[PDB]
Design a protein around this ligand. Structure first.
Ligand code: NAD
Ligand code: NAD
Ligand code: UDP
Ligand code: UDP
Lengths: 332, 332
């Protein structure tokens, strides 16, 4: 990254969220002058937004015309992390997705296009790096919104010199991701938002972890603190118009993820495991390493321990948050 | 195409426009039961929408929630031709483009997704056929909106079986395209909307045609009546989820276009021409021929004659329409 960020003014759109909150904490620790958090708490909890003399919090949508018109050219860096969480919610309501996942990026970039203090605008794009995409195998409106944000990022850079850097990451896990965070977004995935926190929660309650299909599917998990540092490196040193995978380069099967969670938590229950076959089943981190000196080196073992310790410490709070969706969960 | 369209109920979004109006006239002549024209007249004139017992006209945006909620499952075919006209206007105001070029397709498809009477939804996509696209060399928000409409067309077909067919065409010319049609959209291109009507207008006024760079650039022009028939063929016989170039397969240089316009009109003024060089400079029509039996066979010579005859007959009306933008044109 850098202390290029020291004493700077930063906006984090979506900064009350999982990746966002973690980014905000890291920015504060790097000595930034200001974080302007813009977040509508659609998929977040206000407890993730510090009450801090340096942290200004606008509890508004980044699509709000008044808010946009009120923005001043007083930012060195903008991190655009807002999204409509996530695939399942977006399928359920593509219009809610569009408002909070496509229009967000367009109206934000439209406001920022003539700002001159901006050094970098870092857009969380989802998951060497190529800039060719298929109309097919976009499984959700969410996936289309994310890709549309990359189209916008490239356009605004070429047309208006908006200094955009697209940061592609996926399968982020760690402290600050709260099952049930924010409003009901249509489906049980509002609760059960990703495999890692679902597994950690269930394991801490001594419950059998539900392995789907023997858990043969693999993912390149990345610890959230590495993602924060990756985003910061993109800001500091990322080439305007450019794109970087922020990735661990290491794949872990869901069976193995489950196994590790159970052993750390001491959850002594059965795992419906199966051997991975060739027909059962990722981005290279080399560009970010070479160009930004960035490496995501937190192992799945270290990362799971830190996540579990945080979950344990905050279990009551998380449980109380989850419970707000009990009646919608029963209706589904 | 077919008389598969005989006695059917059809909606034409954007049906007061250039391609739209021509499509509506051809539908009426093929004996359709109903055309529901939905058009906000943003880049169109109401004189292009017939007052007809069979033609219902909603002078509303297709994004209007009330209108969308009011739509009944009473359509056999939908043609989605609305756009924010065009590249230049979209650069000027990407937000106006988005509203009338991206959100249009999404909210339309969202309403139509559970309609069961629908045989085909034909989307005008702009310009064998591949479904791979680059984030680069999208010159405008318009170009991004058009591509986003293809993402949506593919998604809605795969997810909801919406029977979409993407019709890719460009450089359409002919009767019904009126210089200055609709509202001021920010730039002189509101008047001077395309090279062909600009040239025909100027030539009829005995003015030198402004050839840019000796006119070496070439385009595959297509007569609007061939485009209408191409759209109808897509509706009748196009494969759901699929895409077709609707194209002439013949390239004409702007110098040659200018030359032909001058000779038909008898405009006896100079042309700043240059020889085309290899470094100075299109979609195949074969898929549509093979699969739909569709061929765009109107030559540039025949098409220009028909267009010029229409322009001549309607010159006063067109001039009066153009004049509404005099004060915005002077301000630009
Ligand atoms: N977590 C992952 O593995 C993952 C993977 C790939 C990409 N991403 C991307 O990373 C970014 C952050 O995701 P996250 O996991 O922190 O999820 P998240 O839901 O916790 O964070 C998104 C934040 O955006 C906010 N938001 C939603 N609509 C808004 C609007 N209109 N205006 C302002 N804020 C709004 C939410 O309230 C939330 O705080 C997103 O862009 C996402 O697409 C995440
Ligand atoms: N003319 C060409 O060479 C060309 C080339 C490639 C693609 N296309 C595509 O063909 C289609 C028709 O283009 P055209 O040349 O007839 O231009 P056009 O401007 O004449 O027609 C577009 C129509 O859409 C209407 N419209 C705009 N916003 C609307 C909204 N929100 N709701 C309903 N209607 C709305 C306009 O009022 C207009 O009648 C468009 O999709 C365009 O992108 C045209
Ligand atoms: O309760 C769960 C939740 C998910 N998974 C698996 O964990 C993986 C999660 O993948 P990812 O987070 O990348 O998103 P997804 O692929 O599901 O869209 C998938 O293989 C799921 O089958 C599981 O076994 N049990
Ligand atoms: O008054 C004009 C208008 C345009 N043109 C040329 O005609 C072509 C029009 O191209 P097209 O319609 O496909 O759209 P464009 O390429 O301009 O975006 C371009 O080469 C222009 O330089 C011209 O010579 N004189």
């Amino acid at each position: 990254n850098a202390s290029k960020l020291a004493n700077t003014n930063v906006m984090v759109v979506g900064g009350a969220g999982f990746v966002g909150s973690n980014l905000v904490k890291r920015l504060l620790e790097l000595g930034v002058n200001q974080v302007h958090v813009v977040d509508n708490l659609l998929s977040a909890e206000k407890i993730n937004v510090p009450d801090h003399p340096a942290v200004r919090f606008s509890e508004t949508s980044i699509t709000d015309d008044a808010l946009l018109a009120s923005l001043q050219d007083e930012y060195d860096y903008v991190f655009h992390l807002a999204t409509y969480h996530g695939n399942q919610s977006s399928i359920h309501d593509p219009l809610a997705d569009h408002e909070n996942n496509t229009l967000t990026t367009l109206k934000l970039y439209e406001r920022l296009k003539h700002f001159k203090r901006l050094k970098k605008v870092v857009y969380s794009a989802a998951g060497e790096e190529t800039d060719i995409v298929s109309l097919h195998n976009n499984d959700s409106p969410y996936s289309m919104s994310k890709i549309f944000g990359e189209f916008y990022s490239v356009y605004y850079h070429k047309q208006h010199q908006l200094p955009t850097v697209r940061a592609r990451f996926q399968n982020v896990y760690g402290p600050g991701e709260i099952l049930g965070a924010g409003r009901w977004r249509g489906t049980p995935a509002t609760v059960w938002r990703n495999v890692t926190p679902t597994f950690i929660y269930k394991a801490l309650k001594g419950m059998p972890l539900p392995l789907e299909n023997g858990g043969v599917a693999t993912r390149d998990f990345i610890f959230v603190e590495d993602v924060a540092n990756g985003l910061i490196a993109c800001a500091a040193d990322g080439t305007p118009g450019g794109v970087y995978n922020i990735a661990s380069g290491k794949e872990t099967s869901i069976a193995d993820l489950a196994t590790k969670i159970n052993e750390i938590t001491g959850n002594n229950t059965e795992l419906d495991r199966l051997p991975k076959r060739p027909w059962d089943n990722f981005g290279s981190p080399e560009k970010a390493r070479r160009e930004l000196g960035f490496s995501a080196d937190v192992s799945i073992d270290d990362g799971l321990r830190k996540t579990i310790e945080w979950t344990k410490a905050n279990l009551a709070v998380i449980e109380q948050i989850m419970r707000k969706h009990d009646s919608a969960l029963a209706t589904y």
